[PDB]
Amino acid sequence: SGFRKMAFPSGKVEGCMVQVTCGTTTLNGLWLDDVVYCPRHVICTSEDMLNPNYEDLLIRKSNHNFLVQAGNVQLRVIGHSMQNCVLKLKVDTANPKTPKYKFVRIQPGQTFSVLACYNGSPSGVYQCAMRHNFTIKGSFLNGSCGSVGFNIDYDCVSFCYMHHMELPTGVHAGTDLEGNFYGPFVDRQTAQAAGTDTTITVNVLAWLYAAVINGDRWFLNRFTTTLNDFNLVAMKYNYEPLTQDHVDILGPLSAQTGIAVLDMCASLKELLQNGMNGRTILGSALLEDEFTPFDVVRQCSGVT
Amino acid sequence: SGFRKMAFPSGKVEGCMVQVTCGTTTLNGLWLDDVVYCPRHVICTSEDMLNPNYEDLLIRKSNHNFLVQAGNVQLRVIGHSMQNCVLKLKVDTANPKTPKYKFVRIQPGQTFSVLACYNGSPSGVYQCAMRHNFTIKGSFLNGSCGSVGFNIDYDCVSFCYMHHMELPTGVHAGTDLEGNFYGPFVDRQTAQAAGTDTTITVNVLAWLYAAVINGDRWFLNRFTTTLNDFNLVAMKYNYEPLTQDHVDILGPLSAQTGIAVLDMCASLKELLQNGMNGRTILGSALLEDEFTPFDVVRQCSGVTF
Ligand SMILES: *[C@@](O)(C(=O)NCc1nccs1)C1(NC(=O)[C@@H](COC)NC(=O)[C@H](NC(=O)C2CCC(F)(F)CC2)C2CCCCC2)CCC1
Ligand SMILES: *[C@@](O)(C(=O)NCc1nccs1)C1(NC(=O)[C@@H](COC)NC(=O)[C@H](NC(=O)C2CCC(F)(F)CC2)C2CCCCC2)CCC1
């Protein structure tokens, strides 16, 4: 038993991290088969990033201008192309450590592991959720752009995030691996700020099921509610509206515990209205919203 | 910026995890060069574990009784011996991806990354602190025994924990890699329970420094205190007594922020006596005590491996 925020083992992604350097700009890249994927702003000086025209800046670059290092070993770039906000550097050597992989665009509320990297080398690994304002609450310093977020399922690594930047509130923004930015953000030093954010209701409910499975059950009230009545309360606390699709993805947890989703909703409604009364749930004094239903299922069942 | 509970990259340890199966008992082992290290109770049936005679149970076993699998490749056992609660299985093939490593015994308050594993396959990675009652608060299911905890210290993987068991309050117990159990615990189904625990004061202070480094300032005050006056308050809240050694290891964080340790102690005193003002610190509504001072330094400076 026990419930912890748990990252995927990072070794499969570690084997793909490289350093990419253009003049005075160094960042991280992702080496899969014979392509290195990295943020396109590697071709910018810091002054270029104030107002870049990427098409023009990339005309000005040759393959030689890209120094790609896998460890201390140089990989020769033999082509370069841009896809939205990502650069794809073709190299002369296919990564022998390439895992089976997919590129996926994730949805608000979904979680993933971040392997935070500097100069192509890993610092550490942690879980993040895509927030509804399309930011994540990570831990990133200068030089971390190009670090990736991912999920692993049995053999397959699904890459879903590539880090780009930090907004002035200290939260983090980036793209999928096709180079499209989550949210209304751009890869330029120009004013942009995170929108308002909601609490991820379906995740809070998943975490309450995690608590029940691990024997933390004081908040269960054995009452029930309707979806409509729950959402009227939840809206007052800036919670995301709960839909029947959310009810369905909680299905495996409702199945395992025998507690109806709407019963858990009644317990959550009372926690919102009354607070926790100096008690904790799974060691927390706030209602945690960065565990998905699948995170709970798979941690509680020991997958892979 | 940002501050997260951050595990070490796990790939160096992943390449060392194997499955060890003896009859009806399967768990995880650690394959370094030509030796696999695993909990000795792999040689026990669940019935044996009620009252095991480990020296007798070991001598009854042959090399053939151990099936060791590294992914899909079987590793033939060519010798076996026992050190405390750890079994060492000599194998015919050396692990070609053995990291530079050390077996270290950690002290209460120190943290490590746990690579949770089942059937020799890693499931996830997360940080744990060794509590003062010598348990850890992890996430472990049946089959997780033999999962290891570790730190990376420059160029060296320092293995410090091998998981054994869960106590009835849901906390977790295990050994170092020499097979000695942290705490007064034994590898047998006999009655044992976690003792009283304290909050790890030096880690709370480190985390408050992490918060200042990341731009929090609301809990800072103009006051300072002494070690003895702080400990009078800490005692009332079941905090570990702050020692001068603790003050010393907080030196680098005090240096970076310019805030003296006993100034930060006066902030912590006010937080304990008056609460957290309905506010969160680094996303927590409680005072977090599972970040060491070096955990703060390594995360805030971007140390890589
Ligand atoms: C890289 O982008 C990087 O490390 N990004 C991720 C970071 N996470 C936390 C801090 S940085 C590189 N950039 C930098 O290290 C950094 C300093 O470069 C000398 N520059 C930036 O991060 C820029 N960011 C911004 O200007 C912010 C300002 C506030 C905002 F809201 F407007 C958003 C942008 C660049 C980020 C990428 C787009 C252009 C500006 C490491 C070399 C690149
Ligand atoms: C292995 O020990 C293991 O997985 N241990 C770690 C666990 N963490 C959370 C749950 S288990 C193996 N054992 C089991 O999976 C498990 C079921 O085996 C059929 N057996 C045990 O965990 C035993 N534990 C106990 O009897 C408890 C009871 C309460 C306590 F406080 F007394 C402590 C021991 C064994 C643990 C190791 C020592 C002997 C008993 C996977 C096959 C081995």
Q: What topology, given as strand order, has the largest sheet of chain A?
A: 5-4-1-2-3-7-6
Number of extended strands of chain A = 13
User: If classified by CATH, what would the architecture of the domain at 201-300 in chain A be?
Assistant: Orthogonal Bundle
- How widely separated are the two ends of chain A? 17 Å
The chain pair with the largest interface is: A-B, 49 and 49 residues
> Structural class of the helices, strands and pairings of chain A?
alpha+beta
PDB class: viral protein
Keywords: Severe acute respiratory syndrome coronavirus 2, main protease, viral protein
Assembly: dimeric
Entry title: Crystal structure of the SARS-CoV-2 main protease in complex with 20j
Q: Which secondary structure elements does this structure contain, and how are they paired or packed?
A:
2 copies of one chain form a homodimer.
Chain A: H1 11-14, E1 17-22, E2 25-32, E3 35-39, H2 54-59, E4 67-70, E5 73-75, E6 77-83, E7 86-91, E8 101-103, E9 111-118, E10 121-129, E11 148-153, E12 156-166, E13 172-175, H3 201-213, H4 227-236, H5 244-249, H6 251-257, H7 261-274, H8 293-301
Parallel strand pairs in A: 8-12
Antiparallel strand pairs in A: 1-2, 1-4, 2-3, 3-7, 4-5, 6-7, 9-10, 9-11, 11-12, 12-13
Helix pairs in contact in A: 3-7, 3-8, 4-7
The structure holds ligand X1Z (2 copies).
PDB class: viral protein
Keywords: Severe acute respiratory syndrome coronavirus 2, main protease, viral protein
Assembly: dimeric
